[model samples]
Target: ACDYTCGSNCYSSSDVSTAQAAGYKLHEDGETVGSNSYPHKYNNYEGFDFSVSSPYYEWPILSSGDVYSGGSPGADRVVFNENNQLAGVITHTGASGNNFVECT
Candidate 1:
């Protein structure tokens, strides 16, 4: 019973919110973390139709149910905007090189 499925990973709504909150908080504080420097701009290079508007930011959400800190961010992501609006859940699981596809 997955609320959202990103490749083989399953996430609930709360998982999305939790990840969003962390990313948004960092964005508000003008901070960045992790190896790849999360809470950074996501250019929407894949051109997916998202409900929320950008300027979009991206953050990693762990499938282990723990918040992302460092290390690998996996293929999954949570996309949010400056206004704390959730743009979408997306992943690199099925897309081509350096591109993303929206999670189902």
Candidate 2:
């Protein structure tokens, strides 16, 4: 949903003028969950119901699970899977001024 600054771990003491990042994310829009159909004849029968939801708007805020220091390690690589609604981060080596990021 918004941009974020990296954490303390990936900071450089000297000068950090040339740094880049690359990554990707998967988003499952209009996700639904619930039982398809329920028995109606039984005394304890229940009706079918479902709920819809969206992915976490913003996540994997850091690059490679950490911030970039002095090197051009590129943007943080984030792996998001809709099935689990979870994401993991990884580091990607990027070019001088190219920061790559992917989203689904």
Against the true structure, whose lDDT is highest?
1
Off by over 4 Å in 2: 1-26, 30-74, 94-104
lDDT of 2: 0.27
Q: Against the true structure, what is each candidate's TM-score?
A: 0.95, 0.22
Model 1 residue runs over 4 Å out of place are none
What does candidate 1's lDDT look like per residue over 1-104, in tens digits? 68889999999999999999998998899888887788899999888788888899999988998888877899899999988999999988998997888899
Give Cα distance to truth, residue 30, candidate 2, Å. 8.1
In model 1, pairs of residues that clash are none
Candidate 2: lDDT of 7? 29
